[PDB]
Structure 1
């Protein structure tokens, strides 16, 4: 199949900015590139057909260009309703294929996360499992590094992260990192630490606790 490479995966736009994103086909596709918008919880919506032709009812700030392999979608001054994912699609030859998408997000000033650590509850421990939760609250941008250390041993493969959608009011993200161990493994160690690296922190922040102490 023809592969479409969209870049960047995440584009950050300040309100009022003129932005553009890219779609590159793995072989010649003529002018047969079409662009779609998909808002959160919505369906794809056709915006631009054949590289540069705008659909009726689509606002004039959208325009497309390109031919051959490299294509561009532009929004001349983004509005808040343009915050969405955008996909390209080729119809040059069968089967038709889609790019992986560019997410348009709100750009704001840097905000450091507020970091909190939560030991496993006594109730959960009685069930045979221990979940340790590290919370990064209301930060920007979305890139953050969270490392677990257990009695100074860096952990790998036993945690999962989850990130909220960008907040509609302050444009920040929040993130959870959850370390899961068996009760026996949890009780083998004392010091549980979450270390958080983020552009907004002048030095990485560590939150930690001693097992069973309070």
Structure 2
């Protein structure tokens, strides 16, 4: 199949900025590249056909360009309704294929997270499992490193992260990192620590607790 490489995966835009993003075909596709917008919880919507032809009803700030393999969608001054995912699609030959998408997010100034750690509850421990939660609250940009350290041993493979959608009011993200151990493994160790590295923090932040102390 013809593969379409969209770049970047995530593009940060300030309101009023002129932005563009890229769709590269793994082989020649002439002008048969079509662009779609997909807002959160919505369906794809056709914006541009045959590289550069705008559909009716689509605002004039959208324009497309390119031919052969390298294609570009441009938004001349982004509005807040343009915050969405954007996909390209080729119809040069069968089967028709789509790129992986570019997500447009709101760019704002750097905001450091506030960090919180939560031991497993007594209730959960009584059930045989221990979940330790590290929370990063309202930060920007989205990139952050969260490392679990248990009696000074760096943990790998036993934690999962979740991230909220960008906040509608302050444009920040929040993130949970959840360390999961069996009750027996949890009770083998004393010091549980979450260390957070983020651009907004002049030094990485560690929150920790001693198992069973309060």
TM-score range, shorter chain: over 0.9
How far residue 180 of structure 1 moved from its aligned partner, in angstroms, is 0.1
Give the corresponding residue for 1:37. Answer: 37
Paired residue secondary structure (2:194) = strand
In the TM superposition, what whole-angstrom CA distance separates every residue of 1:147-186 from its partner, at most 9, and x where no partner exists?
0000000000000000000000000000000000000000
**d(CA) in 2 for partners of 1:66, 1:143:** 32
Q: How many residues align?
A: 214
Give TM-score scaled by structure 1 length. Answer: 1.00
How far residue 212 of structure 1 moved from its aligned partner, in angstroms, is 0.1
In the TM superposition, what whole-angstrom CA distance separates every residue of 1:20-74 from its partner, at most 9, and x where no partner exists?
0000000000000000000000000000000000000000000000000000000
**d(CA) in 2 for partners of 1:176, 1:35:** 34
Structure 2: runs of 5 or more not aligned: none
Give TM-score scaled by structure 2 length. Answer: 1.00
How far residue 211 of structure 1 moved from its aligned partner, in angstroms, is 0.1
**d(CA) in 1 for partners of 2:195, 2:101:** 32
Paired residue secondary structure (1:81) = helix
**d(CA) in 2 for partners of 1:6, 1:197:** 29
Structure 1: runs of 5 or more not aligned: none
**d(CA) in 1 for partners of 2:119, 2:202:** 26
In the TM superposition, what whole-angstrom CA distance separates every residue of 1:170-214 from its partner, at most 9, and x where no partner exists?
000000000000000000000000000000000000000000000
Residues 1:142 and 2:178 aligned together? no
How far residue 132 of structure 1 moved from its aligned partner, in angstroms, is 0.0
**d(CA) in 2 for partners of 1:89, 1:113:** 38
How far residue 6 of structure 1 moved from its aligned partner, in angstroms, is 0.1
Paired residue secondary structure (1:200) = coil
Give the corresponding residue for 1:101. Answer: 101
Paired residue secondary structure (1:124) = helix
